[PDB]
Design a protein around this ligand. Sequence first.
Ligand SMILES: *[C@@H]1O[C@H](CO)[C@@H](O)[C@H](O)[C@H]1NC(C)=O
Ligand SMILES: *[C@@H]1O[C@H](CO)[C@@H](O)[C@H](O)[C@H]1NC(C)=O
Ligand SMILES: [Cl-]
Ligand SMILES: [Cl-]
Ligand SMILES: [Cl-]
Ligand SMILES: [Cl-]
Length: 408
Amino acid sequence: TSINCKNIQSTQLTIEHLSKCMAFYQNKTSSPVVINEIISDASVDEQELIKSLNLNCNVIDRFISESSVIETQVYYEYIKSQLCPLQVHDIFTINSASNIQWKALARSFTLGVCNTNPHKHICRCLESMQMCTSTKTDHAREMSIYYDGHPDRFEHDMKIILNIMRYIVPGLGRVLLDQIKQTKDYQALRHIQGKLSPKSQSNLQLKGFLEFVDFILGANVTIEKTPQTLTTLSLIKGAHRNLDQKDPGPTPILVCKSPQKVVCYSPRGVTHPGDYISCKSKMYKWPSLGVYKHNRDQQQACSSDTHCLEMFEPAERTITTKICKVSDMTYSESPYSTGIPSCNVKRFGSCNVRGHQWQIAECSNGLFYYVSAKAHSKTNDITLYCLSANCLDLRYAFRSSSCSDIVW
Ligand SMILES: *[C@@H]1O[C@H](CO)[C@@H](O)[C@H](O)[C@H]1NC(C)=O
Ligand SMILES: *[C@@H]1O[C@H](CO)[C@@H](O)[C@H](O)[C@H]1NC(C)=O
Ligand SMILES: [Cl-]
Ligand SMILES: [Cl-]
Ligand SMILES: [Cl-]
Ligand SMILES: [Cl-]
């Protein structure tokens, strides 16, 4: 059957049916549509809700991962299918740019089945992108011996495979993959890979990988599944913590004092709940780059990173008309949330933040850090620098966008 990803029903909130709403499954490979045209079918309030987000092809996956309600995530995934066809389908072109990530992971995270007999064609496919044409047919009996009746190993390799596929289907596909990982419902992966394979026939490497995913999904093993507990519009409607005061902040702010998570949905018509943050009981838009703990005061919330350099945008004016449930605060677990005392420095530079110069370093991970005036390298590595004076205190990355006039 077919479903409407713009207005997904309660019965259709399963991995089997949610997989039909992955952007690539829309079979739209060209002609991007402007955002104002994509959203003209929906309600006026939903239209203001989306226009307020300033969606583009660079931020829509972050809005998808950052959203809390599954209907909203599906909706933004459809918007991505309409807004970024080339980006959505670039992975299926052989050796394309979008292929760099999954292959990379495939070389770094060796499967457990590749510990012995590394000349198997699946191992050479993930390691050197060779023999990808015979991944399932080569040594299928030995790999069956390795997998059948061995749930431990099977789960190891399945986790590796899911992590690999998180870079093949970004957005909704990643949500479904993490859901599979949490529920251990490994057979449900057939609803994803089963839709990827007929579109990967030209990408011979991806084709071989997906064929092996099929093979391992056929393993004679038994694992009991964990309940799904996926957040739906129904969970939001049937919940407490109602807010009578839904007033938006007058002006944008940097520091969110007394933060609370908020999820707001319109009372009538088809709606997709929007995410907001309350700061001193004033409504602000939840940023696509995540909410972080202020490094200067960890009971305060910042947008995009821990330095409170990015402005919180006040909520739309119609927020008072919508219903709002307070939700538990969720902070970002991205690398910008965790501080480090030292790093291997690629280069030192100077950057103009808030109108003043600051010595910065780009570490090997690509992140930018303020560099202590007492920074120094460690004994056995000329690139390994203490970012703090005592080489113990943690220092947090900041987005390069808060810089201007970077000088290397
Ligand atoms: C896209 O093509 C697949 C076949 O590969 C089909 O199952 C699906 O329904 C199509 N999506 C549409 C028509 O929206
Ligand atoms: C799977 O393995 C078991 C042994 O654990 C075996 O008895 C059975 O025949 C195999 N095939 C199945 C269950 O289809
Ligand atoms: Cl087309
Ligand atoms: Cl993510
Ligand atoms: Cl810092
Ligand atoms: Cl950045």
